[PDB]
Structure 1
Amino acid sequence: GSHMADYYTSGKRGLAYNNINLLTAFEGGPFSWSYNWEPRPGGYTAGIEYVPMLWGPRGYGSWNADAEAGIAAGSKNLLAFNEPDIASQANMSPEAAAAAYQKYMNPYAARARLGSPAVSNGAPPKGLGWMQGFLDVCAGNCKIDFLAVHWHGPSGNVDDFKRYVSEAIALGQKYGIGTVWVTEFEGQGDEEAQVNFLKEVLPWLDSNAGVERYASFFVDNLVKGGALTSVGKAYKTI
Structure 2
Amino acid sequence: GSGKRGLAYNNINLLTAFEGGPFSWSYNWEPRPGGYTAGIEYVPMLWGPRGYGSWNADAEAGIAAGSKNLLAFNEPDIASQANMSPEAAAAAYQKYMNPYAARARLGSPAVSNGAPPKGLGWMQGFLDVCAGNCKIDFLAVHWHGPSGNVDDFKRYVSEAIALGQKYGIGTVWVTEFEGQGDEEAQVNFLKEVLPWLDSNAGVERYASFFVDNLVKGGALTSVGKAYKTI
Query: Normalized against structure 1, the TM-score is what?
Result: 0.96
Deviation of the 1:188 alpha carbon: 1.1
Distance in 2 separating the partners of 1:181 and 1:215: 8
Q: Deviations over 1:1-54 (max 9, x none)?
A: xxxxxxxxx000000000000000001110000000000000001111000000
Distance in 1 separating the partners of 2:227 and 2:132: 37
Q: Deviations over 1:157-185 (max 9, x none)?
A: 00000000001011111101111000000
Distance in 1 separating the partners of 2:182 and 2:75: 25
Deviation of the 1:116 alpha carbon: 0.1
> Secondary structure of the equivalent of 2:53?
coil
> Secondary structure of the equivalent of 2:148?
coil
Deviation of the 1:118 alpha carbon: 0.1
* Structure 1 residue ranges without an equivalent (≥5): 1-9
Q: Deviations over 1:124-181 (max 9, x none)?
A: 0110000000000000000000000000011100000000000101111110111100
RMSD, matched Cα? 0.4
Q: Deviations over 1:59-115 (max 9, x none)?
A: 000000000000001111000000000011000000010010000000111111100
Larger radius of gyration: 1
Query: Normalized against structure 2, the TM-score is what?
Result: 0.99
Distance in 2 separating the partners of 1:197 and 1:108: 36
Identity percentage over the alignment?
100
> Secondary structure of the equivalent of 2:77?
coil
Distance in 2 separating the partners of 1:27 and 1:93: 39
In structure 1, the residue matched to 2:168 is 176
* Structure 2 residue ranges without an equivalent (≥5): none
What is the aligned residue count?
Answer: 229
The ranges of structure 1 where at least 4 consecutive aligned residues each deviate by more than 4 angstroms after the TM superposition are none
In structure 2, the residue matched to 1:154 is 146
In structure 2, the residue matched to 1:202 is 194
